[PDB]
Amino acid sequence: SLKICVIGSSGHFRYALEGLDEECSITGIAPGVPEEDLSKLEKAISEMNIKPKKYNNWWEMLEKEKPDILVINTVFSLNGKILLEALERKIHAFVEKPIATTFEDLEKIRSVYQKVRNEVFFTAMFGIRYRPHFLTAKKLVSEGAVGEIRLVNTQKSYKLGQRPDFYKKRETYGGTIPWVGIHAIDWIHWITGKKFLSVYATHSRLHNSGHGELETTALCHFTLENEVFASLSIDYLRPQGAPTHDDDRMRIVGTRGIVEVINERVFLTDEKGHREVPLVEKGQIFEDFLREIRGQGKCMVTPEDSILTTEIALKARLSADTGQIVLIEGH
Amino acid sequence: SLKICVIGSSGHFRYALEGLDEECSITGIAPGVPEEDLSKLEKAISEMNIKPKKYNNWWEMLEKEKPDILVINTVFSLNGKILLEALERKIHAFVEKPIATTFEDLEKIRSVYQKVRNEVFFTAMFGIRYRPHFLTAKKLVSEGAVGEIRLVNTQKSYKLGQRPDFYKKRETYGGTIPWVGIHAIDWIHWITGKKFLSVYATHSRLHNSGHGELETTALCHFTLENEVFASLSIDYLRPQGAPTHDDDRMRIVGTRGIVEVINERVFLTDEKGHREVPLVEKGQIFEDFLREIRGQGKCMVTPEDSILTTEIALKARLSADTGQIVLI
């Protein structure tokens, strides 16, 4: 079977809980920092009849539980440092994004992983890919529905509201482009299969509702291979009165047609006209992760994707902090 | 009454035709250049019961017909040269966008216009503003439905197809940023009422279906006052098989709400939820222009707007031709 431990309750640990099978058990949980609020995790756990040991000290949990798999979702700046530990201990890791908040932390993860990659797998929690509307978008693109991709637009818009204090310092938060925008950077990379050449980005922390250094708006412009451009519009300004927490959108413009993801639905315009497209069946990220660990399949969100998209997010944030175009390729 | 001459057939002359009343008459038409195809214009006037004298060149038409209003829509690089002439002669002009394809022409127009502005009026063919969905978005934002604006997204997507040959060269075309994109530049300016501070933009002519130097795709990133950002996605890649020629969109994100224009409809999202908004009655750009000339009201697309949005468009094209952030 597989023994799984969890550190933190500050991210999308639900992706892991919803992917558990009969050959997994969660044997331990721990906060990443002493005062981390474990409410959401602890409530979710009881509701499924599983009884893990609670530790105060995650390091001690690692030594005692010896898990095969670690789910990491704590203070955002700390996720990367715990990931590095997991990799050195050769514990497979399922880690919240971004997988690092500083270039130095990322370079350590990438260097170390290169040395241990034959023995340990990891990947980030890019669960949105697995929703029916994103899988369908990918399916169409792959089967030639838009022909050759020329232009991509993406949108992230989330309800902000009350968040843990660590969101208010850049040092622990890592910025809104890496936190929110990275989902869309991963969509772009995944859907185009193209290399990113450069980024120009801006962000603003004006009107952030007392959230300190947190950015409420950002806009990124990416140049990819073959003169393909992508825009990424980010806001933490989805009004409290909107029906859902999120408004994810993607538009993919090609030589033959245009695919749009909007409102959890997919539309296609081509030589035939404009129509809504029926959706493929949903996937589940942790089930895919587990298949990778068991040798039953390949997880489509790869460690290389997880490193690369974090790199791009940190480069976009650098661009926004310095008001300069930042090169990604060759770097 | 009022006498109107038209120069060219390569632009949105129908804005003018559809704004006529009984106190107007098209008396003269002329090509902007020797070989300019005037079929479109000629088909339209004849279908209307209008018999205007056609001239070999426009400058003789000006000499003879002494028009009150010049409607300028010829080869795009030329529109600004002709406008310059109209202003110097103090003829009111309704001119296609962009009003100039070079900084040099734009600057001449600014110089000359400051001279004659108390006597002569011009503006550019920004007719999309007058559609019910844009008028409604503008009223909602201006009334406070989104609170303070923070972020603006805009989209232009047009069917390309077969076009006059002057589209194929940058020198006569002016580029897809100033031809297609300028509509959205104007929307951003009008809706936010804020100054543009800088633009970063890219464009590409790959897979342009044999349209020579014409760019099929462009992306513009604007910074405005008060750290407001605006994006502008531009394509000539709306598939021929699409049901309409266009897919204009605008999304205005503010501190208290979001207004979206999409598929010619308007949606508002705030504290009370999301809903579709009933649209105000259409306007019509040439009617608005005519009230201005007749002292009956002010035209909402101003000469100053017209200069400023062409300035921004040329700046965005400069950024896209150089790879550099451009200060405005």
**Domains with residue ranges and CATH for chain B:** 1-124 (3.40.50.720), 126-328 (3.30.360.10)
Nearest by CB: A241 against B242, B253, B270? B270
Instruction: Say if residues B109 and B124 touch (Cβ distance below 8 Å).
Output: no
Contact status, residue A224 vs residue A230, Cβ threshold 8 Å: yes
Instruction: Give the 3-state secondary structure of residue B98.
Output: coil
Residues in chain B: 328
* CA distances (Å), origin A162, targets A193, A197, A209, A250, B147: 36, 36, 9, 27, 21
Pairing of strands B149-157, A265-270: unpaired
Resolution (A): 2.1
Question: Residues of B140-152 as b/e, b for ≥16 C-beta within 10 angstroms?
Answer: bbeeebbeebbbb
What is the least distance, in Å, from the CA of A147 to any CA of chain B?
11
* Chain A hits for B233, Cβ within 8 Å: 151, 153, 231, 251
Determine the Cα angle at B316 with ends B217 and B147, to 5°: 95
Query: Could you tell me the CA-to-CA distances from B163 to A150, B159, B208, B214 in Å, in that order?
Result: 21, 11, 12, 11
CA distance B182 to B11: 14
**Tokens for B98?**
């962009």
Which residues does chain A have within 8 Å of residue B241's beta carbon, measured at their own beta carbons?
269-273
Range 261-320 of A in CB contact (< 8 A) with B: 269-274
Asked if A158 contacts A238 with a C-beta cutoff of 8 angstroms, the reply is yes
Breaks (C-N over 2.5 A) in chain B follow: none
Q: Which of B219, B138, B262, B191 is nearest to A219 (CA)?
A: B219
Helix (H, G, I), strand (E, B) or coil at B97: coil
| Distance (Å, whole) CA A240 – CA B270 | 7
DSSP 8-class letter at A36: -
Q: For residues B220 and B199, is the Cβ–Cβ distance under 8 A? A: yes
Q: Chain B neighbours among A 101-120 (CB < 8 Å)?
A: none
Residue type, B230: A
Give the strand order in the sheet containing A122-124. Answer: A53-54, A24-30, A2-7, A69-72, A92-95, A122-124
Nearest CB partner across the interface for A239, out of B153, B226, B258: B258
Peptide bond into B98 cis (omega under 30): yes
- Residue B160's SS3 state is coil
List the single residue in B230, B241, B273 with the smallest CB-CB distance to A273.
B241
| Distance between start and end Cα atoms, chain B | 42
In this structure, are residues A113 and A138 in contact, taking their beta carbons and an 8 Å threshold? Answer: no
Which pair of tokens denotes residue B114?
């400051």
Q: How many CB atoms lie within 10 A of CB B4?
A: 25
Residue bearing tokens 């300019």: B36
**Is-contact B240 B159, C-beta < 8 A?**
yes
Token readout for A100 is 């690092």
Name, in order, each residue with C-beta under 8 angstroms of B195's C-beta and a sequence gap of 6 or more.
B224, B225, B328
- Closest in B230, B237, B251 to A150, CB measured: B237
Which amino acid, one-letter code, is at B235?
D
How many angstroms from the chain centroid is the CA of residue B281? 21
Distance from C-alpha of A124 to C-alpha of A312, rounded to nearest angstrom: 14
Which residues of chain A are within 8 Å of residue B223 when distances are taken between CB atoms? 202
Question: End-to-end CA distance of chain A, in Å?
Answer: 41
Pairing of strands B149-157, B196-204: unpaired
CA–CA separation, B193 and A193 (whole Å): 39
* Residue B42 touches chain A, beta carbons under 8 Å: no
Distance CA B211, CA B168 (A): 5
Dist. CA B256–CA B150, nearest whole Å: 10
Whether a cis peptide bond, with omega within 30° of 0, leads into A98 is yes
Asked if B160 and B209 count as a contact pair (C-beta separation under 8 A), the reply is: yes
Chain A closest-CA separation from residue B140 CA (Å): 16
A202 touches B221 (CB < 8 A): yes
Q: Is B174 left (phi over 0), alpha (psi -120 to 50) or beta?
A: left
Asked if B241 has any chain A CB less than 8 Å from its own CB, the reply is yes
Dist. CA A218–CA A229, nearest whole Å: 17
Size of interface A-B (CB pairs under 8 A): 137
Determine the Cα–Cα distance for residues A203 and A219; give it in Å rounded to an integer. 6
Helices (H), chain A: 14-17, 39-46, 58-65, 76-88, 103-116, 132-142, 170-173, 176, 182-192, 285-294, 303-322
3-state secondary structure of B176: helix
Evaluate whether B189 touches B312 at the Cβ level (below 8 Å): yes
Paired sense of beta strands A229-235 and A149-157, if any: parallel
Question: Cβ neighbours of residue A132 under 8 Å, at least 6 residues apart?
Answer: A264, A279, A280, A281, A282
Mapped onto helix, strand or coil, the DSSP state of residue A146 is coil
CB count within 10 Å of CB A326 equals 19
3-state helix, strand, coil split of chain B in percent (to 5) is 35, 25, 35
Other beta carbons within 10 Å of B210: 8
B157 forms beta bridges with B235
Solved how?
X-ray
A176 touches chain B (CB under 8 A): no
Which run of H or of E encompasses A268? strand A265-270
Specify whether the CB–CB gap between A161 and A240 falls below 8 A: yes
Which residue reads 């203070």 in tokens? A75
8 Å CB contact of A241 and B148: no
Contact A240 B271 (CB under 8 A): yes
CA B277 to chain centre: 26
The two tokens of residue B118 are 């108390």
The dihedral region occupied by B88, where left means phi > 0, alpha psi between -120 and 50, and beta the remainder, is alpha
The C-alpha R_g of chain A, in whole angstroms, comes to: 20
